[PDB]
Amino acid sequence: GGRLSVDASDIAEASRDFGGVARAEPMAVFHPRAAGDVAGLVGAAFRSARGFRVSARGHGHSISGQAQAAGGVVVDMSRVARALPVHSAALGGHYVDVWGGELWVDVLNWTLSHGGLAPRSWTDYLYLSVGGTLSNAGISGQAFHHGPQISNVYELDVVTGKGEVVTCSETENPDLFFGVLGGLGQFGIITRARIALERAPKRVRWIRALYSNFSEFTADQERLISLGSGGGRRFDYVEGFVVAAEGSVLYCLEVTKNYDDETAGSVDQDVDTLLGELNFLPGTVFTTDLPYVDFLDRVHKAELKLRAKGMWEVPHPWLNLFVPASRIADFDRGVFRGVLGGAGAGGPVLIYPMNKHKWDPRSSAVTPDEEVFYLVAFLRSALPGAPESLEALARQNQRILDFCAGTGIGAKQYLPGHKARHEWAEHFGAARWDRFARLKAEFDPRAILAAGQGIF
Ligand SMILES: *Cc1cc2c(cc1C)nc1c(=O)[nH]c(=O)nc-1n2C[C@H](O)[C@H](O)[C@H](O)COP(=O)(O)OP(=O)(O)OC[C@H]1O[C@@H](n2cnc3c(N)ncnc32)[C@H](O)[C@@H]1O
Numbered sequence: 504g505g506r507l508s509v510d511a512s513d514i515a516e517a518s519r520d521f522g523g524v525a526r527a528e529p530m531a532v533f534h535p536r537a538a539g540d541v542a543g544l545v546g547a548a549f550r551s552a553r554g555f556r557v558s559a560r561g562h563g564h565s566i567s568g569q570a571q572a573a574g575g576v577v578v579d580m581s582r583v584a585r586a587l588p589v590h591s592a593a594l595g596g597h598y599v600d601v602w603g604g605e606l607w608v609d610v611l612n613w614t615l616s617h618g619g620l621a622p623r624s625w626t627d628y629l630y631l632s633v634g635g636t637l638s639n640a641g642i643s644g645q646a647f648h649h650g651p652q653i654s655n656v657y658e659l660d661v662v663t664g665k666g667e668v669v670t671c672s673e674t675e676n677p678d679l680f681f682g683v684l685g686g687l688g689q690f691g692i693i694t695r696a697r698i699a700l701e702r703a704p705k706r707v708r709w710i711r712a713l714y715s716n717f718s719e720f721t722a723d724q725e726r727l728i729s730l731g732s733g734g735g736r737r738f739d740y741v742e743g744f745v746v747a748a749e750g751s752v753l754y755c756l757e758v759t760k761n762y763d764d765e766t767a768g769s770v771d772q773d774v775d776t777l778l779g780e781l782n783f784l785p786g787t788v789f790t791t792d793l794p795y796v797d798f799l800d801r802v803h804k805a806e807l808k809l810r811a812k813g814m815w816e817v818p819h820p821w822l823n824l825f826v827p828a829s830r831i832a833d834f835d836r837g838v839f840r841g842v843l844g845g846a847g848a849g850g851p852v853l854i855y856p857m858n859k860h861k862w863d864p865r866s867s868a869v870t871p872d873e874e875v876f877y878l879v880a881f882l883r884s885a886l887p888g889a890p891e892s893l894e895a896l897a898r899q900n901q902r903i904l905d906f907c908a909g910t911g912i913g914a915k916q917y918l919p920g921h922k923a924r925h926e927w928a929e930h931f932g933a934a935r936w937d938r939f940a941r942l943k944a945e946f947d948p949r950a951i952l953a954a955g956q957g958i959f
């Protein structure tokens with residue numbers, strides 16, 4: 504049912520990603536119509552003499568060629584009939600079956616228009632594929648409470664590296680299910696994901712507050728993510744970002760309170776009660792009220808403004824770290840004040856804590872060995888048409904990694920950009936590496952899938 508393409512625009516797109524550095528060209532791009540077509544192509548790679556590389560491409564948002572299949576085939580998973588949300592009395596809630604290539608923005612619009620339902624856990628950017636985020640984790644300000652998107656999926660259909668279509672969940676083929684979740688595309692291509700849904704809020708009370716004291720900023724973020732664990736008043740989203748003085752450093756706390764027709768009468772009091780317990784700088788509270796879809800789509804709005812200034816399609820040497828909360832204080836003087844002290848085209852530096860117990864330890868996701876850890880995301884872009892800007896940002900990234908290494912911070916890379924075998928063994932640790940290698944031997948022995956990750 505599917506078709507191979509050698510269109511130069513298709514080859515060019517499959518040869519690049521949002522990072523703008525890795526450029527390994529495939530021989531062709533495969534456009535599937537259904538799961539059987541993907542099984543057909545992977546099965547042919549497995550049976551073939553050479554065993555050509557096959558990688559699925561979501562929206563191409565990888566930073567360092569993770570979706571590239573050098574001299575092989577890139578499966579363009581982008582999109583046909585769609586399954587309606589379903590209620591289950593056994594699960595005690597709703598779910599929706601989605602194609603692996605579906606973008607979260609399209610999932611949201613579908614579930615809202617069919618019962619006013621929505622996924623509970625997001626990414627900051629919705630123009631990402633379901634299969635792509637589920638192969639990593641999928642985090643945003645809801646992860647402290649609902650866990651990442653890999654903690655909000657009931658079942659998958661996976662095309663293994665042998666071209667076999669397998670339905671898997673916690674009860675059926677769990678090794679493949681938990682292996683695939685956070686599995687960096689190593690054990691198969693997700694063709695269907697069964698996403699957990701909740702009754703969507705209608706609106707969002709979106710708040711930002713400034714801090715000059717890092718100890719107060721982190722203590723407040725850590726206090727906020729411990730709320731609702733006892734079932735009470737809490738925010739529905741907890742993020743943060745590092746701000747430069749002009750326009751020495753400030754920390755911005757970013758929170759939301761979700762509401763609908765029922766809770767609209769208690770939203771102002773819930774917000775004031777939660778904010779009264781915090782230590783932000785007086786007079787630095789910025790508030791906005793907008794529809795839920797608009798809050799969730801906030802980064803796409805920033806993107807359209809950047810595309811207008813020719814500032815979107817530039818190199819993105821983005822670095823994402825998970826930092827144990829016990830070492831976050833040291834992280835600030837050495838990195839935010841140290842390494843970054845004194846930038847390129849600019850970009851956010853995100854910072855917020857998450858609860859490890861919301862992450863299933865059976866999945867392939869690698870988190871620090873601590874109950875509370877932070878995402879620290881260095882999302883700086885290089886200047887357009889200025890290669891030296893990319894070089895300076897890459898040296899800053901290596902300085903951050905050397906700082907963590909030299910002070911023994913047990914940080915773990917999110918969307919790991921490792922390429923050496925000893926870096927991967929170190930990343931996973933002995934037990935996880937052993938589980939990872941064994942899963943690879945079982946589901947992708949010829950190392951056909953997602954070879955751009957550079958693990959096998
Ligand atoms: C560009 C970007 C990325 C991003 C983000 C904002 C922007 C502007 N915000 C994020 C956020 O708030 N939280 C988060 O967790 N991630 C965020 N990201 C990063 C994003 O998750 C990753 O880039 C991820 O790779 C998903 O992006 P995409 O859908 O474009 O996928 P890809 O880059 O093409 O592929 C990634 C890897 O997975 C394999 N792959 C792709 N599709 C599948 C399927 N269906 N099944 C199995 N494996 C799959 C690729 O081969 C590659 O290895």
Ligand SMILES: NC(=O)c1ccccc1NC(=O)Nc1cc(Cl)cc(Cl)c1
Nearest residue numbers: 627628642802805821823851878880882
């Ligand atoms: N305010 C933002 O979150 C933002 C603004 C402009 C461009 C990107 C944005 N956010 C973003 O890219 N978040 C993201 C990006 C990655 Cl690669 C990984 C993770 Cl955990 C988070």
